[PDB]
A paper describes a structure:
[name]/ATP crystals were obtained by incubating and co-crystallizing 5 mg/mL [name] and 5 mM ATP with 5 mM Mg2+. The electron density of the structure showed only the density of the ADP molecule and no density of γ-phosphate, indicating that ATP was hydrolyzed into ADP during crystallization. However, in the structure of the [name]/ATP complex, an ADP molecule was at the same position as ATPγS. However, in our structure of [name]/ATP, Ser38 solidly interacted with the Mg2+ ion, Asp117 was away from the Mg2+ ion, and Lys37 was in the middle of Asp117 and γ-phosphate of ATP at a distance of 3.2 Å and 3.5 Å, respectively. The side chain of Lys37 and Asp117 moved away from the γ-phosphate of ATP in the structure of [name]/ATP compared with the apo-[name]. Lys37 is located between the γ-phosphate of ATP and Asp117, which are on the same line and form an equilibrium state by the electrostatic attraction. The side chain of Lys37 shifts away due to the exit of the ADP molecule, and Asp117 will correspondingly move back to its prepolarized attacking water configuration. Crystals of [name]/ATP were obtained by incubating 5 mg/mL [name] and 5 mM ATP for 30 min at 20 °C, and grown under the same conditions as [name]/ATPγS, except that Mg2+ ion was added to the solution (500 mM NaCl, 5 mM MgCl2, 18% (w/v) PEG3350).
Author numbering: 1 to 82, 89 to 125, 127 to 434, 436 to 448, 451 to 578
């Protein structure tokens, strides 16, 4: 041809080729922003039979992709506001002129395919036209951000064995992923430099995250306006370094941060991008920047399509990053190669740890001090990465995962997520299954809240809002026993007993108490006598509610509720 592929580019091509020689279904490739997505595009098109349509939502993406294609010495058409195998188009423009797209189309590539579900509405008109004309039309997505915290995952199965999204995902498969780690190790991107000790960080250890997992507009703009005096004190140091840098990208937390920054540095040498802007004004600021007509770009919406020019060489991070994906997306905005760019200066000011390579758990943290931890599935061996708390030594205090995420395929094409359940109910189903996939048969499972309300309107019933438990142990002519006593904030209490002597009794005790009560399900608790259990009571959680029925004379435990989540 006219071009030569790097090894990783040929991997991405062969991955795609193998997927569609076996499957009709959509696939995504995960490529960082400096990878040269045009080299994959051009090899697929050299091999294609139809034409190939390369769609973007953002017209500047359509123009960037058309330019980078023809920079290879190749011809292709473009369809936007104003001949070869490939057509480069925007969603709006192509959904308009569908009559001009009536030939053979074998492959449709969607750049930034994470955008697809951001309503838009014309896209599926395109999809259905192309599929009417081309029933076996193959669709490849490309993206650097498969997962946005708050929107979830763009694919379902990953070819490494994890499951990510539900049956809902737009792409059933992710078939190649190029790690930042590797692109930096082999020099295909600019190596990043995070200043070891920058002077005055913010104190975002006060993290009050919403349920989708994103810190709220209010909580940000307010909650550390207690330090809103340091907002000029830090831009001073940013200007210090920017003395010797071509383009600085600064990421605020809110418009109330980004404006209180855009005024605080030089007077017309900076600009402000956020979703609340034109339009024609963004089309002016994309020409001004990258052409370097100003220096500082301040933004709060990290979607920087157009401003990730190669000349940017310092990323200053003025916001806490909830997921690692947001951190990686932000640093990656400044990692492109430029002739004589030695590194990219990363200024981590907020409470943002040092893991450009962290695994993305893929769900909200929960407790703010939660880190990723890896738990091995006792069924299939797969290495899950759940949220957890780990001690100084790297040892596991808690992990929070509920189900193994590995998957497998037989030789009949039937594909299944592993079904090992770290948290369970009954005899077993997910903590939040409505119907028992299979037992007490397909019956309707009793919702915790209803079970508590039923038990409340019983007289022979006790319902204690458990504030903790205490263990005693003892012995007689049949061996040892362990007695657990649950109690609420007023010392109302109720207890149960477990003989530890016989192997059936040992086994029942692992079944009915250690497995519900352990903080590290899947990692077995090692113990010889009740004394070892007392010794390890920190590895045990206490129930959120206990229900005891009456007969006879004494109170007898019947139900324990863990992992509550619905108030009350
Ligand atoms: N196979 C290749 N042969 C020659 N140059 C390449 C190759 N792959 C990538 N490059 C160069 O590496 C850089 C890739 O950056 P870019 O084209 O901006 O990535 P993307 O378009 O994927 O965002 C470009 O400067 C490009 O010319
Ligand atoms: Mg490219
Ligand atoms: Zn498993």
């Amino acid at each position: 041809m006219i071009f030569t592929l790097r090894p990783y580019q040929q991997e991405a091509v062969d991955a795609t080729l193998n997927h569609f020689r076996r499957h009709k279904t959509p696939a995504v490739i995960v490529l960082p922003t400096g990878a040269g997505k045009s080299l994959v595009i051009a090899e697929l098109a050299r091999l294609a039979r139809g034409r190939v349509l390369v769609l973007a939502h953002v017209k500047e993406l359509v123009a960037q992709n058309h330019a980078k294609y023809q920079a290879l010495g190749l011809e292709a058409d473009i369809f936007a506001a104003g001949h070869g195998k490939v057509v480069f188009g925007s969603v709006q423009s192509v959904a308009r002129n569908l009559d001009a797209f009536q030939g053979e189309f074998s492959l449709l590539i969607v750049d930034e395919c994470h955008r697809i579900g951001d309503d838009e509405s014309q896209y599926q008109q395109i999809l259905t036209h192309l599929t009417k004309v081309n029933p076996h039309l193959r669709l490849l997505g490309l993206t650097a951000t498969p997962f946005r915290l708050g929107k979830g995952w763009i694919y379902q199965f990953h070819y490494h064995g994890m499951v990510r999204g539900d049956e809902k995902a737009l792409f059933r498969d992710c078939i190649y992923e190029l790690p930042l780690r590797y692109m930096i190790k082999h020099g295909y991107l600019t190596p990043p430099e995070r200043l070891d000790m920058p002077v005055v960080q913010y104190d975002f250890s006060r993290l009050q995250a919403q349920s989708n997992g994103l810190f709220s507009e209010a909580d940000l703009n307010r909650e550390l306006k207690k330090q809103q005096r340091i907002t000029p004190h830090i831009i001073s140091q940013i200007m210090e370094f920017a003395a010797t840098r071509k383009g600085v990208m600064i990421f605020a937390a809110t418009v109330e941060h980004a404006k209180e920054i855009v005024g605080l540095l030089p007077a017309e040498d900076a600009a402000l991008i956020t979703g609340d802007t034109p339009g024609a004004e963004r089309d002016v600021l994309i020409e001004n920047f990258k052409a370097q007509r100003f220096r500082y770009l301040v933004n709060v919406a990290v979607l920087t399509t157009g401003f990730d020019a190669p000349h940017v060489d310092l990323i200053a991070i003025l916001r806490p990053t909830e997921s690692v994906s947001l951190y990686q997306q932000i640093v990656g905005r400044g990692l492109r190669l430029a002739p004589g760019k030695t590194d990219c200066l990363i200024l981590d000011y907020a409470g943002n740890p040092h893991d450009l390579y962290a695994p993305e758990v893929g769900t909200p943290k929960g407790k703010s001090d939660n880190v990723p931890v890896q738990v091995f599935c006792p069924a299939c061996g797969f290495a899950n990465t759940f949220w957890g708390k780990t001690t100084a030594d790297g040892t596991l205090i808690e992990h929070f995962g509920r189900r193994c995420q590995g998957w497998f395929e037989d030789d009949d094409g039937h594909r299944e997520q592993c079904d090992f359940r770290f948290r369970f109910k009954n005899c077993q189903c997910n903590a939040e299954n409505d119907i028992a996939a299979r037992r007490c048969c397909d019956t309707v499972l009793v919702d915790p809240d209803d079970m508590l309300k039923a038990a409340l309107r019983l007289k022979d019933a006790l319902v204690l809002r458990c504030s903790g438990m205490s263990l005693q142990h003892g012995h007689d002519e049949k061996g040892e026993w362990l007695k657990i006593t649950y109690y609420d904030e007023d010392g109302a209490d109720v207890s149960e007993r477990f003989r530890l002597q016989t192997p059936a009794q040992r086994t029942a005790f692992e079944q009915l108490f250690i497995r519900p009560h352990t903080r590290t399900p899947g990692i077995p608790l090692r113990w010889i006598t009740a004394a070892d259990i007392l010794a390890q009571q920190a590895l045990l959680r206490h129930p959120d509610f206990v229900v005891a029925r009456m007969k006879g004379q004494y109170w007898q435990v019947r139900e324990k509720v863990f992992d509550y989540e619905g108030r009350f």
